[PDB]
């Protein structure tokens with residue numbers, strides 16, 4: 001058969017094996033997650049999408065998973081990010097002081113993976129999966145992230161940080177998961193300030209990108225939720241990583 005059902009890439013190779021392994025590595029590495037049954041976790045992950053229509057997935061579908069994956073993370077040490085995945089995780093790799101969603105059990109299990117099934121059959125689809133835009137938004141992957149991302153932002157408190165790509169077309173994009181889901185599920189009762197770190201890309205220094213109009217847009221949004229907004233440029237990304245790595249070379 002010479003045609004695929006969907007426009008999007010199909011399931012990542014060795015998906016069940018890969019999720020289980022990531023679960024084993026995470027629960028052995030993090031002592032508080034040691035109470036977790038990894039096969040039980042996999043079972044709830046499968047049962048969310050297997051034998052289900054990949055355009056008909058719901059938040060409830062993932063509720064079993066969400067319960068088994070319940071995790072407390074330091075609420076004041078949260079780093080959100082939008083369109084700058086690599087630097088944000090390089091950062092939390094060295095600090096370890098701060099946590100992206102990908103640093104939680106659920107985020108870790110799913111980071112960079114694609115998955116879907118078929119209706120009326122229990123097979124995983126290693127051929128193609130629904131593209132969010134060309135096929136349908138309610139697909140196993142898109143619904144997973146939207147659900148875990150909402151809870152993450154719900155869990156945050158005090159000062160929440162967000163990395164942004166200073167060279168992105170729009171530095172802040174209302175339509176990203178950060179912009180459409182996370183900004184709107186921070187709890188004004190618990191969050192004092194959202195602080196944006198705008199990462200410059202070009203050669204060394206530049207503008208004050210915290211004056212960028214999309215950033216002003218983010219600011220107006222967050223201020224009207226009764227949360228303070230602050231912003232800092234990071235004019236030189238690798239001095240930042242020099243300093244984050246070796247926090248007390250006195251060039252820092």
Ligand SMILES: Nc1ncnc2c1ncn2[C@@H]1O[C@H](COP(=O)(O)OP(=O)(O)OC[C@H]2OC[C@H](F)[C@@H]2O)[C@@H](O)[C@H]1O
Nearest residue numbers: 080081082083101132133142145149176177178179182
């Ligand atoms: N047409 C599309 N094109 C791109 N992304 C799409 C599209 N349609 C849906 N998406 C979703 O949007 C994301 C791609 O945007 P991203 O990876 O740049 O950073 P986010 O702010 O989203 O996600 C990072 C923040 O949100 C959660 C963490 F806590 C971070 O702080 C993908 O994951 C997709 O699921």
